[PDB]
Design a protein around this ligand. Structure first.
Ligand SMILES: CN1C(=O)C[C@H]2CN([C@H]3CC[C@H](Nc4ncnc5[nH]cc(C6CCOCC6)c45)CC3)CC[C@H]21
Length: 279
């Protein structure tokens, strides 16, 4: 079960939803398309409060969280629905997202290859649990992979999760599978998106960068296949412990995940198997 918070409780613990960033002495941690994330303090314990700015995504997040409890899934502590505002309270992840850590945001040291392998395994275990419980994430990306006090990967944002076609195409363009951009809902789309995440882990480069050539990361797969370059040329230079064999092993998994034809992609159980064999 989850704790039922009144809107006034979350108003006070976030210092009246202090929209200034943490760095300037505020409570704002960041923002997405569905809401602003604030740092909160409840009984000497730190929390993450997402104020939604939509009701179906609130209900879906609570529904999926109540059904799915796992080491590699972020934990929901509570919620608020009494006001005209909808809030979701989560366990605070001291090491933020995988995207922020790969970009060494706010002076954090680069993640070692060893830590990156454990994160990839953890994230695959998280997706596996969701698929075993007949749930499709629909928005797998490095920004949706959180890191706890031990750098354990925790898949987040189950607002777009589904228990097939759609008229409302949702997700992050740079990570989305071709059929997902076409309106299809399949667990194979989650596999493709995980393949993009694996490329981000190897390269330390975001999936999309408008001031970069090529703009999209999944295009490096084409340069490697056409023998124009190798994965060795793209290995994150911010690592000192990356070995050619295990990097090529993770790239092989990423390449299999990134097959344009959804039926040629491996299932999450096979992805999990190949990532364990890698280490
Ligand atoms: C502008 N920026 C900054 O000032 C710094 C930097 C951080 N930003 C993100 C903001 C949201 C955050 N999320 C969480 N951080 C800690 N503990 C958590 N527990 C549960 C969550 C989520 C919240 C959303 O719903 C799903 C569960 C969470 C991840 C980092 C990225 C951009 C950068």
């Amino acid at each position: 079960r989850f704790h039922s918070f009144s809107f006034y409780e979350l108003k006070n613990v976030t210092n009246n939803f202090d929209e200034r960033p943490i760095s300037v002495g505020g409570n704002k941690m960041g923002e997405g398309g569905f809401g602003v994330v604030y740092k909160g303090y409840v009984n000497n314990t730190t929390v993450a409060v997402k104020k939604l700015a939509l009701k179906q995504q609130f209900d879906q997040e609570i529904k999926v969280m109540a059904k799915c409890q796992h080491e590699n899934l972020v934990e929901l502590l509570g919620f608020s629905s009494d006001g005209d505002d909808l809030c979701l309270v989560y366990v605070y992840m001291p090491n933020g997202s995988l995207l922020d850590r790969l970009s060494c945001l706010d002076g954090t040291p680069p993640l070692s290859w060893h830590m990156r392998c454990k994160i990839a395994q953890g994230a695959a275990n998280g997706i596996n649990f969701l698929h075993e419980n007949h749930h499709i994430h629909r928005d797998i990306k490095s920004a949706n992979i959180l890191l706890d006090e031990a750098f354990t990967a925790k898949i987040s944002d189950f607002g777009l999760a589904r228990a097939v076609m759609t008229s409302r195409i949702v997700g992050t363009t740079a990570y989305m599978a071709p059929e997902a951009l076409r309106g299809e809902i399949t667990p194979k789309s989650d596999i493709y998106s995980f393949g993009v995440v694996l490329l981000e882990i190897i390269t330390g480069l975001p999936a999309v960068d408008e001031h970069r050539e090529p703009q999209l990361l999944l295009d490096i797969k084409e340069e490697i296949e056409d023998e124009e370059k190798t994965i060795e040329d793209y290995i994150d230079k911010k690592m000192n412990d990356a070995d050619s064999t295990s990097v090529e092993a993770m790239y092989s998994v990423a390449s299999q995940c990134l097959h344009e034809k959804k039926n040629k992609r491996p299932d999450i159980k096979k992805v999990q198997q190949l990532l364990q064999e890698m280490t």
